[PDB]
Each structure stands twice: as structure tokens, then as C-alpha cells.
RNA sequence: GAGUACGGUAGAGGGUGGUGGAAUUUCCUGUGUAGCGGUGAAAUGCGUAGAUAUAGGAAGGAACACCAGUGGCGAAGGCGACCACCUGGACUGAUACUGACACUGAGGUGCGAAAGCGUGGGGAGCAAACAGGAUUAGAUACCCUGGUAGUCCACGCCGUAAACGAUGUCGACUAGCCGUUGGGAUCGAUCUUAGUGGCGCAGCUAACGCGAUAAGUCGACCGCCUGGGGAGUACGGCCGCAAGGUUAAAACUCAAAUGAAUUGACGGGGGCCCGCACAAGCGGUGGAGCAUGUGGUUUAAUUCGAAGCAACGCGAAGA
């Protein structure tokens, strides 16, 4: 999440570059992560949930 | 409402100006289909303008109009705890309609002799943007401009 | 009365769900000037908009403006909006910006947070 | 069958020490000036005694981002930073060895999340109790601002959980298909082994559903149930420092309580669609005077009937 304008572009590259570095980096997932105190039992049901929706999206595939 | 089935209806029968803007102003000022008193009120209200000074009645009427329209106009919409007013531009056929509303309606609290010099002494008015009608056009513009927090 | 100059500042934009706080500073860390969404008008929920952030760094611009600073790096800190508008408006206000970081602190395991709301 | 000796693998299995990096909070200092914080909106609270923000330094405690996965290990409870030391089990291959040495298990013994208790340390964050601010008819709550025991460590006690796969342990058989974890072979493919997941034929089930990780077909042993309340309560016994735990009834009362599924209705559940339903407009009612119907009251009688929308200029198109 660093960027650097470089050679003159105009700042509508660096800014869209920027937001796109910052999507990839998980900046704002990590922010909301952490907000508040999520029990290891939530923790738990929403991993299970996750992979059963991910395996039964991947089977779907085919 | 739902349908988008209904077009708009056109009449143009303007008899001696040759002016649609001026019959949807008789219209305006009509009241239980008296169609003729208002165009006499109309007409009256023009030959004291053209005869209080050298100013022809209709460009004094159109540039009347014209620092009247409003620019942008306020929406409300809740959100659960407080209802916030957006603004949003008026649309080009809109503030026509909305400034002869106006208009008209505050030459009928105007509080002089009658409905035809009323009239007179709203359009001298307002074609140097003096009057309560204006008064009410910056207010809004005034209202909308410091809600622009929403504008979106 | 007493006055200085400086180029090549920093800029310092810490947004959050609630407010946004905008510091021109020069490269050691010295504030310059300052501005907030607070600070400019809105107090509320119109406080927390991009459009608050926007007024509240050219606000801060134009204070700094007075010792120069054609130069500008940007640091931006914070989850709330107005994490763009901001930095559009400082060339807006006339800069020309070297590059852009973004400095939120992430906890590795760090303290816990507090209790989930029931709303 | 069950065990032993020999190479090799995988692992948040356990215990004792040491060390990292990110972040929070407090303290000191420089820049700088009027807001910060919070909310559905606010307010309490923090700031011109200089806050928030930004930079440099220090102290201290706790939890280990990414890897991370229907992944792994453990009898279960459970176990996520890195390194060293001590240590248990599992899986895997060949050869040799002992020769039924096995399974289960009333009593009994031991391990057992969190909260809790005793003695002694520690104190960042969070947070029962508690105080203030809102909301409300009230609000001993949800929301906001703070905050103590506790959460952490050493030793000891407590012995309970929706301690769940709501499914006791051990052994043998019964079509297949697609993943994944730790190994072997044969020529990316095939075979096979111990775990971990999704489907599915038989078969089973009240149905839902299970289906080689059976709830199928069979053996060995143990625990438990006999309508709902009273009640896992009372009394006694044994444990505990205490909270309490464990074993465990009776009178009385009811004629049901219950599981799975079907049709409808409903929801401050979801997705589309419509209607003067909203939104954009015009004219009214509610105030005055009168007309008229109704309620109530009065009267010898004020004759019956119509009563939310769907009664009241209604039966009555004529007291
Ligand atoms: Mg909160
Ligand atoms: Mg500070
Ligand atoms: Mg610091
Ligand atoms: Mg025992
Ligand atoms: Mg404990
Ligand atoms: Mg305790
Ligand atoms: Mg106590
Ligand atoms: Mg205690
Ligand atoms: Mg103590
Ligand atoms: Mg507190
Ligand atoms: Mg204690
Ligand atoms: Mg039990
Ligand atoms: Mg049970
Ligand atoms: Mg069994
Ligand atoms: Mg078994
Ligand atoms: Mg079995
Ligand atoms: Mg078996
Ligand atoms: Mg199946
Ligand atoms: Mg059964
Ligand atoms: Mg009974
Ligand atoms: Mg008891
Ligand atoms: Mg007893
Ligand atoms: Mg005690
Ligand atoms: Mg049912
Ligand atoms: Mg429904
Ligand atoms: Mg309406
Ligand atoms: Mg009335
Ligand atoms: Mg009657
Ligand atoms: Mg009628």
C-alpha cells in the first residue's frame, strides 16, 4: 500500500494504482476485522460456514 | 406512478400575444374554469406595466421569469432516526412551472387593490428580483446549497 | 508576525467512521497547519462524508500555502471516508505530490477489542 | 489375534527456560491551535492550566497478522511467534522373535473448558458489580462515557458444560463416484495402507435421514429408560473451606406431555408485481350559521331496525 508518481502521469493513474494497491493489501478487511472482540466459537462457525460454501460452490463447477 | 403510461397534452391558444409561456400563465392564474377573467386579469395586469413606463410587458414578464426559476431544489428521505434533504438539480421543465406557481401565488398575498395590479406590481418587481417570490428562491438555493453534504 | 519558509512537506490524513483530521507537516514531523470535518462546519453525520474531507484539506492547504511547499508526500491513516477525497483536494490546492503511502497500524496479536454491539 | 527387536517420516501432543516484531496504554520533550470523542441523533467525558493530530525517547503487560486448509496432533478436555533442553504416542518397510500372552469391565483409581475459591506476585487491553449520560409511560436493560474483582503467573482446591457426532468400547462382512492428509510399491497413470470430507445402490427408519467414519447384517461385555409435573427436589450418607457436587424419594395433581412431517395463516424474513398507496399538484372537512341522520337526556309516547372499514341525507322515491 506505498505508490510513487513517477514520469509525469496524470493523478487519476496514481490514484486508481494506489486504491488498487490498497485493495490487494486487505487494508480495510484487516481494519473491520478487529473492530470488536469476535468469540472463538463465531470464529469457529464462520470458518465452517466459509468452507462448506466454498466446496459446495466448487462442486457445483462441474 | 407505476404504469409510465400517461403522455402530456398539449394546448397552445394564445389570442393576441401569440405566446405559449403567457397561456400557461392564464392558466395558472385561472379558478373554476374562468378561462376569460383571467385572461382579462392578464392583460391588465400587462397594459399597466407597458403603461407605468417604457418597458415592453412581455420581455419584462419573460426576464421576470427568468431571476425566478430556482437552480436546485430539496428532497427529503429518512434513514431511520432523521430524514436528510438532499438537493437536486430541477429539471429544465420544472422550474417554469414552479416559478409561475410562485409567482402567482404571492401576487395573491400581495395586499393592494386588485388581482390585475397585484400582478403589475409582482412582475415590476421581480424583473429587479426585489420581491417575496425571490426572497423564497435564495432561501431554497440557500437550503439546498448548505445540505451539500448529501448531494451524492 | 514571525513567519518561515519550507518546501517539501508531508501530509497526514487520519480518517475514521466519525471524523477526519488533515496535518501539513515538514519532513522532521513539525505541524505547520491543521484542519478538520469538524472544524469546518458540518458537526454530525454530515461530518462523516467525503465531502467534509474535501473542505477540510483545501482549508488546510490554503492555511500552509504561506510557506511555500510546492512539494508534498502523503500518508493516509484510517478506515473512514474522505480517504481519497482529501488527497485529490491537496493538488487540487495547487501541489505536486511525490508519492502516496498508506501508515494504518495493524495489530499482529495485540490487545483485544472491545465487546460486540447489540443493536 | 496380541506384543518385541531394527531403519524412516509427519505433527498448534506435553513440560522447563530464553528471545523477537506489530499494535495499544501511560510518562517525558519538540511543532502547533481550537476543537476532540461519541451516536440513529445527542449528551456525559476530554481540551486554550494548550487537548486531538505529528515527531523523538522510555517503561510495562497480554496476545501471537500473513502462512491457515472439510489441514494436523491428542483418550477426552484441548493444543497456533521463534530457538534450545527433557519427554509420550501414531504412521511406514523388510526380516527375525514370543506363542492366545486377548476383549469388556460393577466397585476403584486418574485426567477433565469456563466461571469460582485460598496464599503470594503482576496491572497494558477488556470488563460482571458500580457511577454518570441518553431512550422510555417506566428502563434496576439494549446504546454512550468511565470503571473494580476477574482475565495473566506459581502452588493447592473445585469436578461441573448443548463436556454433542445429542450416536459406549472391541472384532468380522456388504455396489460404486469425487476430493484431501502422512507414507509405501508398479509403469504423469495404476494398486495399496492409516486418517479426514461430500454424494450414492442395496438394506434400515415413524419420518427426517444413515449408508465401509452405518443408524445395514452379526458376535462379546458394560451403562441406561419405563406418561407429564412435584423433581434431579426433600431427608439421610460420602466428598468440599465455601459455592456446592454425588447417591436419591413420597404425598399430591393432570389426561395428556412428546417426535417427524403436511395444508393454511402470520413475521418489526427474502425476491418480483400492482392500486390517488405514497411522492408532484387542485379543491375541501375539522372553526361560524342553517339543513339532516345518530348517540345521550327528557317525556304519556318520543314506534321498530341498521353499529369499524362493510351504520349515521341508511329501510323512508316525501311523518
Ligand atoms: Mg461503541
Ligand atoms: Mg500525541
Ligand atoms: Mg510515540
Ligand atoms: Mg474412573
Ligand atoms: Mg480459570
Ligand atoms: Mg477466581
Ligand atoms: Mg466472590
Ligand atoms: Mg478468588
Ligand atoms: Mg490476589
Ligand atoms: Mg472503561
Ligand atoms: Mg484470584
Ligand atoms: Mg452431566
Ligand atoms: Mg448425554
Ligand atoms: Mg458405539
Ligand atoms: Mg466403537
Ligand atoms: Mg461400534
Ligand atoms: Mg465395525
Ligand atoms: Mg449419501
Ligand atoms: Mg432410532
Ligand atoms: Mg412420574
Ligand atoms: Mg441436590
Ligand atoms: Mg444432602
Ligand atoms: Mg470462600
Ligand atoms: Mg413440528
Ligand atoms: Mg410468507
Ligand atoms: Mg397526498
Ligand atoms: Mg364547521
Ligand atoms: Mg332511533
Ligand atoms: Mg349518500
Known amino acids: ?62 | 406512478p407505476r404504469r409510465r403510461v400517461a403522455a402530456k397534452r398539449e394546448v397552445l391558444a394564445d389570442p393576441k400575444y401569440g405566446s405559449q409561456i403567457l397561456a400557461k400563465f392564464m392558466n395558472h392564474v385561472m379558478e373554476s374554469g374562468k378561462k376569460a377573467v383571467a385572461e382579462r386579469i392578464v392583460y391588465g395586469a400587462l397594459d399597466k406595466v407597458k403603461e407605468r413606463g417604457k418597458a415592453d410587458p412581455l420581455e419584462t414578464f419573460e426576464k421576470a421569469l427568468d431571476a425566478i426559476a430556482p437552480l436546485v431544489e430539496v428532497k427529503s428521505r429518512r434513514v431511520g432516526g432523521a430524514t436528510y434533504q438532499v438537493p437536486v438539480e430541477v429539471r429544465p421543465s420544472r422550474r417554469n412551472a414552479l416559478a409561475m406557481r410562485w409567482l402567482v401565488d404571492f401576487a395573491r398575498k400581495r395586499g393592494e387593490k386588485s388581482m390585475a395590479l397585484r400582478l403589475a406590481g409582482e412582475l415590476l418587481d421581480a424583473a429587479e428580483g426585489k420581491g417575496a417570490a425571490v426572497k423564497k428562491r435564495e432561501d431554497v438555493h440557500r437550503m439546498a446549497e448548505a445540505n451539500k453534504a448529501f448531494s451524492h | 508576525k514571525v513567519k518561515k519558509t519550507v518546501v517539501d512537506g508531508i501530509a497526514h490524513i487520519h480518517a475514521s467512521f466519525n471524523n477526519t483530521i488533515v496535518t501539513i507537516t515538514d519532513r522532521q514531523g513539525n505541524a505547520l497547519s491543521w484542519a478538520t470535518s469538524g472544524g469546518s462546519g458540518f458537526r454530525g453525520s454530515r461530518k462523516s462524508t467525503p465531502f467534509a474531507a474535501q473542505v477540510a484539506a483545501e482549508r488546510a492547504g490554503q492555511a500552509a500555502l504561506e510557506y511555500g511547499l510546492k512539494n508534498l508526500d502523503v500518508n493516509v491513516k484510517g478506515p473512514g471516508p474522505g480517504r481519497e477525497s482529501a488527497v485529490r483536494a491537496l493538488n487540487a490546492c495547487g501541489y505536486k505530490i511525490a508519492s502516496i503511502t498508506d501508515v494504518t497500524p495493524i495489530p499482529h496479536n495485540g490487545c483485544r477489542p472491545p465487546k460486540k454491539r447489540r443493536v
Open chain 1, 1 to 62: 500500500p506505498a505508490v510513487k508518481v513517477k514520469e509525469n502521469e496524470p493523478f487519476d493513474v496514481a490514484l486508481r494504482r494506489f486504491k488498487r494497491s490498497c485493495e490487494k493489501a486487505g487494508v480495510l478487511a484487516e481494519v473491520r476485522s478487529r473492530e470488536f472482540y469476535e468469540k472463538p466459537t463465531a470464529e469457529r462457525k464462520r470458518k465452517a460456514a466459509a468452507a462448506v460454501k466454498r466446496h459446495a460452490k466448487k462442486v457445483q463447477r462441474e
